[PDB]
């Protein structure tokens, strides 16, 4: 059971508010609005369709009512000019900011529209953010930020250097969101995540994940290919978890707010174990090889989470076996 | 003797380079050009007129040759414009970054403008530079880095949290820089400048910095104001040690790059000290009121210097008294 969670879900239902969704037509953001929308909220979302979807939101648009799809009102637009960013702001009582152009090697071959997206961009929605005086602001931030500090499991007050354009621009934002605190009254949180996987987290194009990227391969008998030695380890964590970090921060007492907390499970798999569990997984819906290392990789990544248990009352429920369970079939329909 | 900084600017004068010099309309920056085509240098200007004025490059025109003024090339632009940016790199070996909108209380009221400025315009010429192979990158960082850390003197490993919206963008500079040695094998140096003052320091607008500020003052028979008790203490640190700390450091050899350095001389004044030695210069030149503290103050700076006199062979030859008596007069000129 998810108690404080249920609880504040319940609140949300009875006494229904106005939401923004940045990132809306992507897999963290449709993913939040499909929750949302099944609450009876009332949604704004902004998008670019850059990294995201219109079929995101073509689905969502199944999966809820039509009472419930009335309450959505869809901006296509740019978190780079500040105008749509206070357009959309209006009335807006929640903001949850997902919108950013991701993936470390995308920062390394792109540092400048990257910059712009996850830099400018970010400031934009938080400066519109303030001045219209919304009751809260919860955004995306990124484990990539420990960057090279060796210890195990990572801690929130602990960091490293950065080991990339990535790592910095949400670094950034953490630092630009404390100064909104500290100088305006503005407070927020941000939310570390680690390695989020499930539906419509997007298979294709150059920069996939690799869990959607191994099922696309795995499905498709083409060669999966591993980055390194495969001893590489990671937080895998699935997208339900986030959903309720996100929904708890929103609605976080204001002494829980004006910090960061890691969004994972506190579990460790490697690269190896993983095209292990996946296999497993698709193989019961009824259906290997070496490369060098990603450059500015992070090595080994276990969140340690007591800090959200603690604070906000998060209880993270599903694993990553489970997750990829609750996955393949999207997987499979999607891809067929 | 300063034995280095001699030995290399007659160097210079026998093997001139071609420099770039964003902010050169500025303070800062039109100090550079004087000192670089007075080398007989080869000198490529950027500036918007943002804070820079036309007036200042009309000045530095009046005090070096027709053939010396003939290798100044200017370009009016804005370094948030990435071809810009690229288009003034060509042919380039030493870059002196100085192009930024200074003051803690601007980005306070405006943190957009400073944000793409400081962060967005500084990375465009980071990147261009790092694209075009110039031979040494050398840019405009800031004390205000040090942030809410309690040590005093400053010394450059340790820092705290950034205490402005403009703190953030100088600090992030610097992280920037440092992810560029890392991932592009790009060797920069940052300069921490502590409170510079000399000619052609702008003593008008919303903005101004006390010495000017209090000097402009002085000669009308305006009020001098002092925000506090007085007490409050800065590393004053006369023009011509910053210039000689970035002629250093564009020709410094490949291990004291990558690097920070504080750009002070080591001494702290007081504002009560300060009246007194601005008042007294003045009158060899022949010709008060107490409020509240300026908010998100530093109540006392002051740097270390010895990184850059150990690693770079700085002299901080300069103190306040000889630059307070070397820039009066240029205040008087510029005022009558
Ligand atoms: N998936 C993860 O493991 C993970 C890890 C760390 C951080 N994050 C962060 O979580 C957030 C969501 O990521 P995701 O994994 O859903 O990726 P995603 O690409 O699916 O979604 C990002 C969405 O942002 C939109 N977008 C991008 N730039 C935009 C702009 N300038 N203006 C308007 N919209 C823009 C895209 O079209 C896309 O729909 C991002 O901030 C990302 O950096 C995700
Ligand atoms: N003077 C100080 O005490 C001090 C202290 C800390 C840091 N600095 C830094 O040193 C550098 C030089 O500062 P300064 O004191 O001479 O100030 P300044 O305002 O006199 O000069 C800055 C110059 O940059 C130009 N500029 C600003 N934005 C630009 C843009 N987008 N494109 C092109 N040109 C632009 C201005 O027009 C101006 O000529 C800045 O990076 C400043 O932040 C100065
Ligand atoms: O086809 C692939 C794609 C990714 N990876 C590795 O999987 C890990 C997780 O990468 P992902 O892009 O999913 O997330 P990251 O940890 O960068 O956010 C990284 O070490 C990648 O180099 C891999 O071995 N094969
Ligand atoms: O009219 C003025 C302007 C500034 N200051 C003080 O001078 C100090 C340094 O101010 P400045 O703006 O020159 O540079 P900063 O330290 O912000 O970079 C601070 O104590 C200010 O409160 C002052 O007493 N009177």
Same mark, same amino acid.
């Given at each position: 059971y998810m108690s404080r969670y249920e609880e504040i879900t319940q609140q949300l239902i009875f006494s229904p508010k106005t939401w923004l969704? =940045?990132? %809306?037509?992507?897999?963290?953001?449709?993913?939040?609005?499909?929750?949302?929308?099944?609450?009876?909220?009332? %949604?704004?979302?902004? +998008?670019? &369709?850059?990294?995201? $979807?219109? @079929?995101?939101?073509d689905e969502v648009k199944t999966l809820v009512s039509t009472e419930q799809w009335s309450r959505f009102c869809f901006i296509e637009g740019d978190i780079r000019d500040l105008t749509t960013c206070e357009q959309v702001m209006k009335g807006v009582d929640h903001v949850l900011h997902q919108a950013a152009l991701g993936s %470390?090697?995308? #920062?390394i071959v792109d540092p400048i529209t990257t910059n712009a997206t996850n830099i400018t961009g &970010? !400031?934009?929605?938080?400066?519109?953010?303030?001045?219209?005086?919304?009751? #809260? &602001?919860?955004?995306?931030?990124?484990?990539?930020? @420990?960057?090279? $500090?060796?210890? !195990?499991?990572? %801690?929130?007050?602990?960091?490293?250097?950065?080991?990339?354009? @990535?790592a910095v621009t949400k670094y950034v934002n953490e630092i630009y969101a404390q100064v909104y605190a500290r100088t305006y009254g503005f407070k927020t949180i941000g939310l570390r995540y680690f390695n989020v996987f499930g539906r419509r987290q997007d298979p294709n194009g150059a920069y996939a994940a690799v869990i959607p990227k191994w099922t696309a391969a795995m499905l498709k008998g083409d060669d999966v290919y591993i980055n390194?030695?495969?001893?590489?380890?990671? +937080? &895998?964590? @699935?997208? +339900?978890?986030?959903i309720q970090m996100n929904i708890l921060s929103a609605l976080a007492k204001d002494s829980?707010?004006?910090?960061?907390?890691?969004?994972?499970?506190? +579990?460790? =798999? =490697?690269?190896?174990? !993983?095209?292990?569990?996946?296999?497993?997984? !698709?193989?019961?819906? $009824?259906?290997?090889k070496y490369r060098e290392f990603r450059s500015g990789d992070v090595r080994h990544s276990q969140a340690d989470v007591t800090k959200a248990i603690d604070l906000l009352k998060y209880r993270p429920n599903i694993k990553i076996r489970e997750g990829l369970r609750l996955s393949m079939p999207w997987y499979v329909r999607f891809l067929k």
């Amino acid at each position: 059971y998810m108690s404080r969670y249920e609880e504040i879900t319940q609140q949300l239902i009875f006494s229904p508010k106005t939401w923004l969704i =940045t990132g %809306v037509a992507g897999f963290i953001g449709s993913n939040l609005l499909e929750k949302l929308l099944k609450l009876n909220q009332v %949604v704004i979302g902004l +998008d670019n &369709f850059s990294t995201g $979807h219109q @079929y995101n939101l073509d689905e969502v648009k199944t999966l809820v009512s039509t009472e419930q799809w009335s309450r959505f009102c869809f901006i296509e637009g740019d978190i780079r000019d500040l105008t749509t960013c206070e357009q959309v702001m209006k009335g807006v009582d929640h903001v949850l900011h997902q919108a950013a152009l991701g993936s %470390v090697p995308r #920062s390394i071959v792109d540092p400048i529209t990257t910059n712009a997206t996850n830099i400018t961009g &970010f !400031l934009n929605i938080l400066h519109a953010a303030k001045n219209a005086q919304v009751q #809260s &602001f919860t955004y995306a931030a990124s484990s990539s930020t @420990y960057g090279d $500090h060796p210890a !195990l499991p990572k %801690v929130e007050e602990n960091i490293g250097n950065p080991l990339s354009p @990535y790592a910095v621009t949400k670094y950034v934002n953490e630092i630009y969101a404390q100064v909104y605190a500290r100088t305006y009254g503005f407070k927020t949180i941000g939310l570390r995540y680690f390695n989020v996987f499930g539906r419509r987290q997007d298979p294709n194009g150059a920069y996939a994940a690799v869990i959607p990227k191994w099922t696309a391969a795995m499905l498709k008998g083409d060669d999966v290919y591993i980055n390194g030695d495969g001893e590489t380890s990671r +937080d &895998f964590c @699935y997208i +339900d978890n986030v959903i309720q970090m996100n929904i708890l921060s929103a609605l976080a007492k204001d002494s829980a707010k004006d910090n960061i907390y890691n969004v994972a499970v506190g +579990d460790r =798999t =490697t690269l190896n174990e !993983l095209s292990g569990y996946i296999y497993d997984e !698709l193989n019961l819906i $009824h259906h290997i090889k070496y490369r060098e290392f990603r450059s500015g990789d992070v090595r080994h990544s276990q969140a340690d989470v007591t800090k959200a248990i603690d604070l906000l009352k998060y209880r993270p429920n599903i694993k990553i076996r489970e997750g990829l369970r609750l996955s393949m079939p999207w997987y499979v329909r999607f891809l067929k």
